[PDB]
Amino acid sequence: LTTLDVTKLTPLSHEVISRQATINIGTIGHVAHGKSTVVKAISGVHTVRFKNELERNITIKLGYANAKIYKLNFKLVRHVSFVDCPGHDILMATMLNGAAVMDAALLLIAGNESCPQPQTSEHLAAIEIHILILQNKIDLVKESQAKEQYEQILAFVQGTVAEGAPIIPLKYNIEVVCEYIVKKIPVPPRDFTSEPRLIVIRSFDVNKPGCEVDDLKGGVAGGSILKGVLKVGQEIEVRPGIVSKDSEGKLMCKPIFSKIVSLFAEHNDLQYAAPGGLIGVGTKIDPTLCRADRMVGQVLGAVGALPEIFTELEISYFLLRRLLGVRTEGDKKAAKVQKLSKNEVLMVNIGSLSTGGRVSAVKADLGKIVLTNPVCTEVGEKIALSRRVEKHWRLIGWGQIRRGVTIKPT
Amino acid sequence: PPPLQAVLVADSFDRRFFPISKDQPRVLLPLANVALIDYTLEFLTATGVQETFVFCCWKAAQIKEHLLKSKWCRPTSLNVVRIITSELYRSLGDVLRDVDAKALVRSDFLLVYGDVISNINITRALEEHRLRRKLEKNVSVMTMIFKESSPSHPTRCHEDNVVVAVDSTTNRVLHFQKTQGLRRFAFPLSLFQGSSDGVEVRYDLLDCHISICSPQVAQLFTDNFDYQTRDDFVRGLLVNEEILGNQIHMHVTAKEYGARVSNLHMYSAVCADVIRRWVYPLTPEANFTDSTTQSCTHSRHNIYRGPEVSLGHGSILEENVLLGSGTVIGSNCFITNSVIGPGCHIGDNVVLDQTYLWQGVRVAAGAQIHQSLLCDNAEVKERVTLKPRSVLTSQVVVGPNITLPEGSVISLHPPDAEEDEDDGEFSDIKVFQNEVLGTLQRGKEENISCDNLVLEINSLKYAYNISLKEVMQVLSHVVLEFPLQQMDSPLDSSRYCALLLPLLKAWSPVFRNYIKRAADHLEALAAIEDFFLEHEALGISMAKVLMAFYQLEILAEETILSWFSQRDKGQQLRKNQQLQRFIQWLKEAEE
């Protein structure tokens, strides 16, 4: 049981005021969606069950898992949120679009085989960037374990070019990994004094069917806060808002204003929200505007964020020649990113804002991407560029916004 | 359940009707003196649809004006039609994304195109879809309607032929593909693992392009923003079955008609079917779009005659002829299997076979017209013969004494038309080295950044699990070989020094980052010795190459001394005056 209060001015990453989630640590490995068992053994199985709906983007949404590390009748020392999405490509694209995401990593390597999945994981770790590799190949002979350790050390010798000097080796391994994480993970510098800014990654409608007119709650949004601290009762605004084109003209976006009536983590959170976790800021928004995942892709500002609404963006890009770390046995032009074809839909991913964009024009140094929906990110931020080759979106290159079309409706 | 809804895409996002579609939308093209939009609206109304959404982008003004004057926009129409226009539409995926954005639909709507001729009643298919949805709890997301047919029918065009593999006991679509240009069809084995009890492969299905959809369809379309066509959705959904199952089922009709007009072949086939009462009760004499102009009487051999047709003396109407109001036919004519629009004027001793004439067409005496289309107000002069598959667009005249070939398409627009028309007729580690060399060559041409270039080289090394010493040897060998490519066949040392200058300076950060350890420096020197020996013609400039490593700090001063001290045949090459002078100069300059 915690005793969080509403009296704080300059909190810290390791401060005990929050003690829920302050540091986000990534988890990319060759588990192939098998890391759920390790996460449950390290954090808990049923720890996250507070709002459910019909899933929409299973493989394109980043998922978190809150966990508090306790040490020495035990006292909690640190709290870290483990992030593990299906497919390392999405996490790599999201992380390498700025900063303040996945401050730590855990390479879930395997001691049984050294297939191309470890190479892809190493390439993703190098591209995204304090890593901590760990082998989950349990139930092996002592000689087999020694041979696997030797092979892992041989691989890490090459992998140490960027970051390859970790050490790790059923619950005993989990405890050892937890101790190593507590000992080695450093506190990242987060700007708590800045204005709060939240990016929505999950929307819900808590009002159950056939409810009374008294117990009618709505506007239970969600997402992650990068810079700033959100306090209950503050007047918040949605940067995207409601976008309509019924006026027989250009798309018009009207921002939505509300007040933070609640703030809920996996457990019961206090009136103040801290960066580095999945905090659901339930405002006084009508559930009709916020149904299941109908608000995803909007930035919940506080004081009218300067980022204007952008319809099209001129981005100078450096397309990567081949697939990052993907060299299959065949490689029959599959791992070869072609040039930016005109009228081609690409997944523009600015930080954690996953949106869609088609290429309108390009002359050898800069494309003019028209987005499927307006976004409010920046005027010169780094925007990644992705494209699926076979039913799987994968990173294609980088980008830098130079100009755009602004929409400023009242 | 709520009233049945329907989304009617009134714009085909593909140009299969140039130059006809350059002044009139394909949706408004008259099939049997009635526009296609009227046919599809009648089909929607007759099957119980109570709310319709028309999404028109290309020439939306004409479609809006035509719809507002139509029967379905009257206050007495039970099928309420909503007109939504947008210039930003580019595909059916955009239309469905907009539908999901504005939340037009609530449950189990209809997706059809604006050029679908049908008389299908979907009550049984809708009931089956709803029962399946209720029993499976939101698994079946779409129910596509197919018509039993034969591969040899004129309606089965080569472009839109489709082969579908299904589960025979639940009418579930397991695989779906088009047979355009394919002489042999292939099916993955993953079909047979699940429904091993029964699997059928059907090629006798004609795609009516009618689907019973759920709001989950629009949700999936807006989730995958790159989807553009219904076929894209079907393929992407059927390949992604392990997660988000979202299965698709189907319905087959046998005694009902349905087909969409996609090109001139489909246009002619569907027009012939409509005239021959294959789409009953949607017949020319039914006047399902109630209007004074489009009233006609049916006679023997499917002859439809309008008011004041005034047939001449001796002219014979063989069969399957529709004559519009106000038409005038000369004497000794012979019209068969043809549709003639209202207000046409026809001369004497003409022959019309499987031809289509729209409003205002004027034909002079003695013409011979076979299997051709004449658009609005087209004119043909005296004694002109039109071979099959000919098209004359609006306001087009053809001069006398000319026989247009069997593919003539002429209009008033020069580029799109094949002939501009007017009042006249005439006038192991080896692959890594190649990839590194290819990336370096591409990077140099495009001026790739050092950090980006280093990452690409590192990514290739990690992908192939290359070692550290091997990478240093490979990098030096690839770079050295690349400088040799600067000169075609000079076989001189001066050219090698010229090429090694830009290569070393531009790629200095990459080499320095990769070559930092003393062991790597020793390996790099050994690789340089092999490169110099293998290029002894250009190896006379080895002194400059050795100085380049020290100048770029890739190889330290002690590394050069250690390499020179260590020796043989290579030592004799390193014992030359040029090599000795460079070592002495470097030692004195350093200190």
mmCIF file of C-alpha atoms in Angstrom, chain B residues 66-311:
data_model
loop_
_atom_site.group_PDB
_atom_site.id
_atom_site.type_symbol
_atom_site.label_atom_id
_atom_site.label_comp_id
_atom_site.label_asym_id
_atom_site.label_seq_id
_atom_site.Cartn_x
_atom_site.Cartn_y
_atom_site.Cartn_z
ATOM 1 C CA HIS B 66 -28.181 13.861 -62.265
ATOM 2 C CA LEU B 67 -29.011 12.301 -58.889
ATOM 3 C CA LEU B 68 -30.973 15.314 -57.630
ATOM 4 C CA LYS B 69 -33.323 15.039 -60.628
ATOM 5 C CA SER B 70 -33.648 11.252 -60.302
ATOM 6 C CA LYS B 71 -36.464 9.223 -58.758
ATOM 7 C CA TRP B 72 -34.531 8.215 -55.632
ATOM 8 C CA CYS B 73 -34.064 11.823 -54.463
ATOM 9 C CA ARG B 74 -37.825 12.365 -54.254
ATOM 10 C CA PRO B 75 -39.370 12.709 -50.774
ATOM 11 C CA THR B 76 -41.441 9.581 -51.504
ATOM 12 C CA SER B 77 -38.413 7.315 -52.028
ATOM 13 C CA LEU B 78 -37.897 4.727 -49.294
ATOM 14 C CA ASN B 79 -34.166 4.528 -50.126
ATOM 15 C CA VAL B 80 -32.744 7.713 -48.620
ATOM 16 C CA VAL B 81 -29.623 8.723 -50.560
ATOM 17 C CA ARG B 82 -26.837 10.837 -49.059
ATOM 18 C CA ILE B 83 -24.376 12.584 -51.378
ATOM 19 C CA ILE B 84 -20.837 13.043 -50.041
ATOM 20 C CA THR B 85 -18.165 14.568 -52.278
ATOM 21 C CA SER B 86 -14.421 14.960 -51.780
ATOM 22 C CA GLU B 87 -11.517 15.703 -54.128
ATOM 23 C CA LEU B 88 -9.063 13.878 -51.832
ATOM 24 C CA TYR B 89 -10.490 10.432 -52.631
ATOM 25 C CA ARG B 90 -8.065 8.163 -54.491
ATOM 26 C CA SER B 91 -9.310 4.601 -53.868
ATOM 27 C CA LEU B 92 -12.083 2.574 -52.268
ATOM 28 C CA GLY B 93 -9.852 2.313 -49.206
ATOM 29 C CA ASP B 94 -10.072 6.085 -48.815
ATOM 30 C CA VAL B 95 -13.870 5.876 -49.025
ATOM 31 C CA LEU B 96 -14.030 3.211 -46.315
ATOM 32 C CA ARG B 97 -11.584 5.159 -44.141
ATOM 33 C CA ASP B 98 -13.832 8.215 -44.455
ATOM 34 C CA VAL B 99 -16.871 6.077 -43.587
ATOM 35 C CA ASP B 100 -15.134 4.887 -40.425
ATOM 36 C CA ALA B 101 -13.976 8.433 -39.635
ATOM 37 C CA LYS B 102 -17.462 9.955 -39.795
ATOM 38 C CA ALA B 103 -19.056 6.717 -38.478
ATOM 39 C CA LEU B 104 -21.663 6.510 -41.236
ATOM 40 C CA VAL B 105 -22.534 2.867 -40.594
ATOM 41 C CA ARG B 106 -23.525 0.962 -37.464
ATOM 42 C CA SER B 107 -23.895 -2.687 -38.534
ATOM 43 C CA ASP B 108 -23.879 -4.890 -41.653
ATOM 44 C CA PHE B 109 -23.863 -2.430 -44.540
ATOM 45 C CA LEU B 110 -23.590 -3.071 -48.286
ATOM 46 C CA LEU B 111 -20.507 -2.337 -50.392
ATOM 47 C CA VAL B 112 -21.174 -2.074 -54.137
ATOM 48 C CA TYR B 113 -19.796 0.002 -56.989
ATOM 49 C CA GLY B 114 -21.704 2.581 -59.002
ATOM 50 C CA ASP B 115 -21.770 0.493 -62.195
ATOM 51 C CA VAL B 116 -23.352 -2.769 -61.006
ATOM 52 C CA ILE B 117 -26.275 -4.197 -62.986
ATOM 53 C CA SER B 118 -28.167 -6.695 -60.851
ATOM 54 C CA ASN B 119 -31.538 -7.987 -59.675
ATOM 55 C CA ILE B 120 -30.204 -9.997 -56.728
ATOM 56 C CA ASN B 121 -32.232 -10.167 -53.514
ATOM 57 C CA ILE B 122 -29.786 -10.495 -50.623
ATOM 58 C CA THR B 123 -32.298 -11.450 -47.911
ATOM 59 C CA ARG B 124 -31.024 -15.024 -47.566
ATOM 60 C CA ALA B 125 -27.373 -13.959 -47.728
ATOM 61 C CA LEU B 126 -27.974 -11.239 -45.132
ATOM 62 C CA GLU B 127 -29.758 -13.674 -42.810
ATOM 63 C CA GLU B 128 -26.937 -16.210 -43.153
ATOM 64 C CA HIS B 129 -24.335 -13.512 -42.473
ATOM 65 C CA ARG B 130 -26.186 -12.275 -39.384
ATOM 66 C CA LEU B 131 -26.712 -15.790 -38.004
ATOM 67 C CA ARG B 132 -23.044 -16.640 -38.568
ATOM 68 C CA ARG B 133 -21.966 -13.399 -36.881
ATOM 69 C CA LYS B 134 -24.214 -14.103 -33.889
ATOM 70 C CA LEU B 135 -23.012 -17.695 -33.505
ATOM 71 C CA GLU B 136 -19.292 -17.007 -33.995
ATOM 72 C CA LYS B 137 -19.253 -13.724 -31.997
ATOM 73 C CA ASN B 138 -17.781 -11.317 -34.547
ATOM 74 C CA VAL B 139 -15.419 -13.509 -36.574
ATOM 75 C CA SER B 140 -16.920 -13.346 -40.075
ATOM 76 C CA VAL B 141 -16.234 -9.832 -41.352
ATOM 77 C CA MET B 142 -17.394 -9.981 -44.990
ATOM 78 C CA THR B 143 -19.766 -11.974 -47.198
ATOM 79 C CA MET B 144 -19.027 -11.610 -50.916
ATOM 80 C CA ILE B 145 -21.736 -12.439 -53.459
ATOM 81 C CA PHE B 146 -20.873 -14.632 -56.447
ATOM 82 C CA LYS B 147 -22.926 -15.889 -59.385
ATOM 83 C CA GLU B 148 -22.725 -19.390 -60.830
ATOM 84 C CA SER B 149 -21.407 -19.075 -64.373
ATOM 85 C CA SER B 150 -19.237 -20.723 -67.024
ATOM 86 C CA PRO B 151 -15.689 -19.710 -68.018
ATOM 87 C CA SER B 152 -16.720 -19.374 -71.683
ATOM 88 C CA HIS B 153 -19.512 -16.845 -71.120
ATOM 89 C CA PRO B 154 -19.073 -13.387 -72.697
ATOM 90 C CA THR B 155 -19.526 -11.823 -69.251
ATOM 91 C CA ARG B 156 -16.410 -13.648 -67.994
ATOM 92 C CA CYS B 157 -13.790 -11.162 -69.141
ATOM 93 C CA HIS B 158 -10.146 -12.197 -68.939
ATOM 94 C CA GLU B 159 -9.338 -9.170 -66.768
ATOM 95 C CA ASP B 160 -11.737 -9.928 -63.903
ATOM 96 C CA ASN B 161 -11.637 -13.740 -63.917
ATOM 97 C CA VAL B 162 -11.103 -15.085 -60.401
ATOM 98 C CA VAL B 163 -10.414 -18.522 -58.915
ATOM 99 C CA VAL B 164 -11.491 -19.094 -55.310
ATOM 100 C CA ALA B 165 -10.698 -21.971 -52.952
ATOM 101 C CA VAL B 166 -13.370 -22.363 -50.283
ATOM 102 C CA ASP B 167 -14.599 -24.592 -47.475
ATOM 103 C CA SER B 168 -17.586 -26.364 -49.012
ATOM 104 C CA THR B 169 -19.449 -27.032 -45.750
ATOM 105 C CA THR B 170 -19.390 -23.501 -44.277
ATOM 106 C CA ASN B 171 -19.036 -21.354 -47.441
ATOM 107 C CA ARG B 172 -15.832 -19.853 -46.021
ATOM 108 C CA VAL B 173 -13.347 -18.305 -48.449
ATOM 109 C CA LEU B 174 -9.877 -19.770 -47.880
ATOM 110 C CA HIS B 175 -8.009 -18.451 -50.937
ATOM 111 C CA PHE B 176 -8.811 -15.919 -53.643
ATOM 112 C CA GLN B 177 -6.815 -14.844 -56.679
ATOM 113 C CA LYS B 178 -7.112 -13.375 -60.162
ATOM 114 C CA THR B 179 -6.279 -15.369 -63.291
ATOM 115 C CA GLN B 180 -5.147 -12.518 -65.562
ATOM 116 C CA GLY B 181 -2.327 -13.826 -67.741
ATOM 117 C CA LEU B 182 -1.862 -17.038 -65.738
ATOM 118 C CA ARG B 183 -1.846 -20.388 -67.536
ATOM 119 C CA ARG B 184 -1.479 -22.310 -64.257
ATOM 120 C CA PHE B 185 -2.911 -21.685 -60.789
ATOM 121 C CA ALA B 186 -1.211 -22.333 -57.452
ATOM 122 C CA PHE B 187 -2.640 -22.844 -53.962
ATOM 123 C CA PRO B 188 -0.715 -22.858 -50.655
ATOM 124 C CA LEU B 189 -0.799 -25.936 -48.446
ATOM 125 C CA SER B 190 -1.959 -23.919 -45.419
ATOM 126 C CA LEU B 191 -5.490 -24.217 -46.812
ATOM 127 C CA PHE B 192 -5.598 -27.966 -46.164
ATOM 128 C CA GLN B 193 -4.264 -28.028 -42.590
ATOM 129 C CA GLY B 194 -7.342 -26.480 -40.979
ATOM 130 C CA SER B 195 -10.367 -27.596 -43.003
ATOM 131 C CA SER B 196 -8.999 -30.936 -44.172
ATOM 132 C CA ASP B 197 -12.518 -32.414 -44.154
ATOM 133 C CA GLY B 198 -13.613 -30.424 -47.201
ATOM 134 C CA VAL B 199 -11.947 -28.011 -49.631
ATOM 135 C CA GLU B 200 -13.259 -26.972 -53.052
ATOM 136 C CA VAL B 201 -11.592 -25.045 -55.876
ATOM 137 C CA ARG B 202 -14.108 -23.039 -57.902
ATOM 138 C CA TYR B 203 -13.467 -21.315 -61.229
ATOM 139 C CA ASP B 204 -17.157 -21.027 -62.215
ATOM 140 C CA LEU B 205 -17.886 -17.955 -60.067
ATOM 141 C CA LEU B 206 -18.611 -14.566 -61.630
ATOM 142 C CA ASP B 207 -17.732 -11.673 -59.326
ATOM 143 C CA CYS B 208 -20.785 -9.441 -58.928
ATOM 144 C CA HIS B 209 -18.678 -7.056 -56.785
ATOM 145 C CA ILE B 210 -21.363 -7.006 -54.079
ATOM 146 C CA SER B 211 -20.364 -7.504 -50.454
ATOM 147 C CA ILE B 212 -22.177 -7.565 -47.123
ATOM 148 C CA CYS B 213 -19.725 -5.885 -44.758
ATOM 149 C CA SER B 214 -19.457 -5.012 -41.067
ATOM 150 C CA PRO B 215 -18.018 -1.858 -39.469
ATOM 151 C CA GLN B 216 -15.035 -4.082 -38.676
ATOM 152 C CA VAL B 217 -14.271 -3.885 -42.408
ATOM 153 C CA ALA B 218 -13.907 -0.101 -42.210
ATOM 154 C CA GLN B 219 -11.936 -0.483 -38.976
ATOM 155 C CA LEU B 220 -9.510 -2.871 -40.687
ATOM 156 C CA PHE B 221 -9.259 -0.533 -43.679
ATOM 157 C CA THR B 222 -8.317 2.405 -41.459
ATOM 158 C CA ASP B 223 -5.906 0.192 -39.502
ATOM 159 C CA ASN B 224 -4.056 -0.729 -42.718
ATOM 160 C CA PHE B 225 -3.977 2.707 -44.346
ATOM 161 C CA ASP B 226 -2.192 1.332 -47.439
ATOM 162 C CA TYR B 227 -5.191 -0.753 -48.535
ATOM 163 C CA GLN B 228 -6.697 0.591 -51.752
ATOM 164 C CA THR B 229 -8.922 -2.127 -53.260
ATOM 165 C CA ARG B 230 -11.254 -4.834 -52.002
ATOM 166 C CA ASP B 231 -8.880 -7.439 -53.449
ATOM 167 C CA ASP B 232 -6.042 -5.990 -51.367
ATOM 168 C CA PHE B 233 -8.188 -6.331 -48.244
ATOM 169 C CA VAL B 234 -9.160 -9.916 -49.075
ATOM 170 C CA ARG B 235 -5.578 -10.987 -49.793
ATOM 171 C CA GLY B 236 -4.060 -9.256 -46.765
ATOM 172 C CA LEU B 237 -6.748 -10.685 -44.500
ATOM 173 C CA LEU B 238 -6.437 -14.229 -45.850
ATOM 174 C CA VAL B 239 -2.651 -14.210 -45.494
ATOM 175 C CA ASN B 240 -2.853 -12.828 -41.923
ATOM 176 C CA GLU B 241 -4.954 -15.624 -40.450
ATOM 177 C CA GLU B 242 -2.893 -16.831 -37.470
ATOM 178 C CA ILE B 243 -3.562 -13.526 -35.694
ATOM 179 C CA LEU B 244 -6.786 -11.510 -36.007
ATOM 180 C CA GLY B 245 -8.598 -14.400 -37.719
ATOM 181 C CA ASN B 246 -11.469 -12.286 -39.071
ATOM 182 C CA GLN B 247 -12.644 -14.850 -41.596
ATOM 183 C CA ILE B 248 -14.522 -14.091 -44.825
ATOM 184 C CA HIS B 249 -17.493 -16.097 -46.115
ATOM 185 C CA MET B 250 -19.439 -16.066 -49.369
ATOM 186 C CA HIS B 251 -22.828 -16.595 -50.995
ATOM 187 C CA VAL B 252 -23.603 -18.088 -54.414
ATOM 188 C CA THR B 253 -26.682 -17.184 -56.455
ATOM 189 C CA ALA B 254 -27.891 -19.232 -59.419
ATOM 190 C CA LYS B 255 -31.256 -17.841 -60.598
ATOM 191 C CA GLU B 256 -30.351 -14.154 -60.159
ATOM 192 C CA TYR B 257 -28.194 -11.834 -62.252
ATOM 193 C CA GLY B 258 -25.362 -9.526 -61.263
ATOM 194 C CA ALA B 259 -22.310 -8.034 -62.970
ATOM 195 C CA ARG B 260 -20.401 -4.756 -63.005
ATOM 196 C CA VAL B 261 -19.464 -2.778 -66.112
ATOM 197 C CA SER B 262 -15.673 -2.409 -66.109
ATOM 198 C CA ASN B 263 -14.784 -1.901 -69.790
ATOM 199 C CA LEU B 264 -16.312 -1.880 -73.269
ATOM 200 C CA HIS B 265 -16.422 -5.689 -73.398
ATOM 201 C CA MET B 266 -18.401 -5.836 -70.154
ATOM 202 C CA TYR B 267 -20.504 -2.894 -71.338
ATOM 203 C CA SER B 268 -21.519 -4.705 -74.529
ATOM 204 C CA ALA B 269 -22.131 -8.021 -72.757
ATOM 205 C CA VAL B 270 -24.290 -6.471 -70.034
ATOM 206 C CA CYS B 271 -26.210 -4.364 -72.561
ATOM 207 C CA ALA B 272 -26.964 -7.488 -74.598
ATOM 208 C CA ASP B 273 -28.078 -9.293 -71.436
ATOM 209 C CA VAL B 274 -30.325 -6.400 -70.371
ATOM 210 C CA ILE B 275 -31.971 -6.114 -73.795
ATOM 211 C CA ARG B 276 -32.625 -9.877 -73.819
ATOM 212 C CA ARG B 277 -34.452 -9.621 -70.452
ATOM 213 C CA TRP B 278 -31.766 -11.445 -68.464
ATOM 214 C CA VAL B 279 -32.104 -8.888 -65.640
ATOM 215 C CA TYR B 280 -35.877 -9.137 -65.276
ATOM 216 C CA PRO B 281 -37.758 -7.164 -64.045
ATOM 217 C CA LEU B 282 -35.145 -4.509 -64.937
ATOM 218 C CA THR B 283 -36.251 -4.423 -68.573
ATOM 219 C CA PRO B 284 -36.358 -1.460 -70.988
ATOM 220 C CA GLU B 285 -40.166 -1.451 -71.083
ATOM 221 C CA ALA B 286 -40.474 -1.627 -67.285
ATOM 222 C CA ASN B 287 -39.373 2.028 -66.993
ATOM 223 C CA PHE B 288 -38.024 1.462 -63.488
ATOM 224 C CA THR B 289 -36.688 5.039 -63.618
ATOM 225 C CA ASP B 290 -40.100 6.574 -64.279
ATOM 226 C CA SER B 291 -39.740 9.221 -66.985
ATOM 227 C CA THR B 292 -41.682 10.325 -70.044
ATOM 228 C CA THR B 293 -38.679 9.952 -72.360
ATOM 229 C CA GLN B 294 -37.711 6.354 -71.531
ATOM 230 C CA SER B 295 -41.096 4.695 -72.119
ATOM 231 C CA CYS B 296 -41.297 1.969 -74.751
ATOM 232 C CA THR B 297 -43.340 -1.024 -75.881
ATOM 233 C CA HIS B 298 -42.072 -4.596 -76.198
ATOM 234 C CA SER B 299 -42.844 -6.678 -79.286
ATOM 235 C CA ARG B 300 -41.786 -9.978 -80.833
ATOM 236 C CA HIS B 301 -38.079 -10.882 -80.954
ATOM 237 C CA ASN B 302 -37.261 -8.375 -78.179
ATOM 238 C CA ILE B 303 -38.032 -5.245 -80.207
ATOM 239 C CA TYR B 304 -38.513 -2.203 -77.970
ATOM 240 C CA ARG B 305 -40.106 0.793 -79.688
ATOM 241 C CA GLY B 306 -40.473 4.237 -78.157
ATOM 242 C CA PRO B 307 -42.966 6.980 -78.964
ATOM 243 C CA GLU B 308 -42.775 8.642 -82.399
ATOM 244 C CA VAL B 309 -40.107 6.357 -83.823
ATOM 245 C CA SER B 310 -41.467 6.673 -87.394
ATOM 246 C CA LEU B 311 -39.854 3.661 -89.032
#
